[model samples]
Target: MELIKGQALFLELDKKDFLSLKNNDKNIPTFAHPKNQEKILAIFSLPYKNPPQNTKLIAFYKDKKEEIFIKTLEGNYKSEKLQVENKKIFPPKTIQERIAKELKEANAIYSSYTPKALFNGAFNIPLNSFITSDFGKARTFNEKVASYHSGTDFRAATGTPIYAANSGVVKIAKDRYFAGNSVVIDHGFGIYSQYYHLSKIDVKVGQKIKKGELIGLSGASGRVSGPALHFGILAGGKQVDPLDFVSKFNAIFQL
Candidate 1:
């Protein structure tokens, strides 16, 4: 397959969908094009792998019931957990709608060419605070089986300073459904970072900021239980745990 820079087209995914695969050690390979059709471009948020040679390809069988292979650039790949909600009879429509909307928005934002903007190494925790809800935990609200906890939730008071976890341009800075006052940054090459439940947003769309820059203040907005930031990171349309990238780093504390 002809490499598009170094990777293939990555689809849009939310925080949960993005993280479920980002931390994976498997390198997805680009499948050979079927008869050389015009190469198309797709937006991804799964940690900004350059070109089309960095990821592996997986062939699924029978409507996702069976899998073929996870061809990778590095040959071997790793298996891991899929953080999904209960396999209930049916998932509610409203929740599904929200997921679709978020994916669409994320895809559209990355369509613009802002490649080469991922946080190198790992992302740093935005606040020096204890994690209220750690990542990858199966969550239950009021004893009812809720969605699996995807991102790391850290507890902080209102007006806590939120800094830029990496270098990128602001893509979305508006009031979101569950994020309350939210800011989404496109860290190029389909890599993005998001901050929700904030009381203030200091950065604007199209603005380029470096790592450690102040962007907003934390708050209990939207679907939040307390004053804190619901931080998220994406690469190639896959959700890599924020801690996976930022765990070795620390936020430049300020308020």
Candidate 2:
């Protein structure tokens, strides 16, 4: 399979006998679900920048090895520049400390892998609305600090209900410096979905949530231009295109 930078690749193994799967010699998580009997699903995300030219996936079975090669293409992500008046480019020391702690907590959740498939079938969109910003767009704040849009932003008004993308356990549900009232769900097998910039979070950490369940209400809670919902998907601890990830993940059910 061929994928561009900032996308995820999903492969379905015909047999569940494989002991493990690895991408470019690095071990990746895999899961088996009742919907796809006797098969295992493997997923991995490509980097938005400086991605490898090629990747080799090796599945280690009991007595044999199966391999697949994937080619990566460069992404044509658009650049955006914005000017802010009288706003400090950097946060205060106390705010920085809080951001650091939040980063560590989020990283720990993303890096951890759950063996079972918490989701049953295709994932759903958190909100059926217009997308204000897409994933992987490079942004320059006052032409100084550069960053990429790590998630897809949906046009939502204050108090707009945000639903869970799929069945999973809530790993995080709290107010943050950048994300504000955010909720993150772990869908097992190194896959996670995040909802940020919420006005109110109805879910709690460690709660098991179902697909289409109300998780939060969207608002301008974070450092956003307006009220919007930032939805993100992380595969193997790397942020990928959330919309594309859902499409690729749902395609597995068709096979």
Candidate 3:
């Protein structure tokens, strides 16, 4: 089994006594592989913008079923610097009422568990610009460790078209204080993808969008130096690398 920070792990456990699996100390979610009932699917996110490490997986079978059933290794992660302009966007602060409201609303969205899978085959990228930021990149504010870039950023112009990475019902298509014009698509089965920092939103809540369907236009709508698209993917309600999600979609879905 291969494990990387910000990505997921897929394994077909042969243990007939396998009862359940936990994501261990890593705060993340786990599920039986979507297409294969005999397999296990897990995501151990790298705490926002942190690096990967030796993680643990605790399983329970007939008893406290299994032990530290994990694939562990010394891991290396991508390290890069965002241009000076994006340093200000590391983390944003806002009023209490509005922040609380947004947090609750986001929790509701992330906690949703629709048991249907709405996408198939390979996922698509909404913009043509190459990746400008990775998940492991460190961000700073006031010379203090602020946060990690939770999503991958694409170098898009102000009006660059944004599209759906996969088929899903639009769960959120509204402007936010930090994310700006944000859109979150619930791809069903506890899987979701997000598009942020959009300049124009063309979709609405509850709209069903196809892969490559237009969702919005990219721009620097939030606390950023310029225009770009911040794309993210979440499985089991935890953030996973969008690029990993894209590359593994077909294999994981058995398409």
Candidate 4:
């Protein structure tokens, strides 16, 4: 498999009794295939920035360990420059403190691991619309502050309904400093999906959401150009391309 930065890789172990899988000393979550109990599945994501050049994957069974190696490739991402006239770009001290607190809360949710896979079958896109902005775009605001687009953005008018990509427990359903109204779903096995910039959120924290269930309505709630849905996916605590992650995740069913 070609491992690129900001992408995810899926592995199917021939032995179904594997205890765990790890990459570069960090544990990667492993789960049993829903239809075929004799198959074990493992997945991990490469970070958007500074991904390793080479990867070593180790899988452990009852009494033996298996290893695999792959080289990573750089992604071809475009640079985007935008001019904004909002003071929120450089927030005040109080807003900065609030942003820090929000980051800590979000990081805690992403870093925590769940052993079992909560989602069933294939994952779906939150909205069926044209993509406004692609993931991993190197964005510069006013030629000063620089960052990367961590998620995919879909064009949606305000109040457009958004659906859950898969079944999971709602981890967050509230307004955030940057994300505005957001909904995060924990799909177990260290997988999470987020929907941002919503005008109204229909779900609540800790709620069990099903695939295709209405979660919110898209709007320009947070820092954005207009009404759109920012869809993001995190695997094993690393943010990756949501489209790539969904395709790779669904490929397990074809195995």
* TM-score top scorer: 4
Cα deviation in Å at residue 134, candidate 2?
1.0
- Which runs of model 2 end up more than 4 angstroms from their true locations? 14-17, 33-38, 80-90, 140-145
Tens-digit lDDT track of model 1 for 1-255: 222221223332222112122223543322112223432123322222222334443332233421222222421212244455456656589978886797688678755545343444435557777877655453444443354444678888898998887677788887766668888887655567778888888988788877788998898888636677787766555555566544312231121
lDDT of 4 by residue, 61-159 (tens): 888899888778876778768665334467689998999999999999988888876786789888888898999887566543266889999999999
Q: Rank the candidates by TM-score, best first.
A: 4, 2, 3, 1
Clashes of 4: 0
**Runs in model 1 with CA error above 4 Å?**
1-103, 110-113, 118-122, 139-146, 247-255
* Per-model lDDT: 0.56, 0.85, 0.71, 0.84
TM-score of each: 0.56, 0.86, 0.77, 0.87
lDDT of 2 at 238: 87
- Number of backbone collisions per candidate: 34, 0, 2, 0
Q: lDDT score of model 1? A: 0.56
- Please report the TM-score between candidate 1 and the true structure: 0.56
TM-score winner, 3 or 4: 4
Span of 10 residues, lowest total lDDT, candidate 3? 85-94
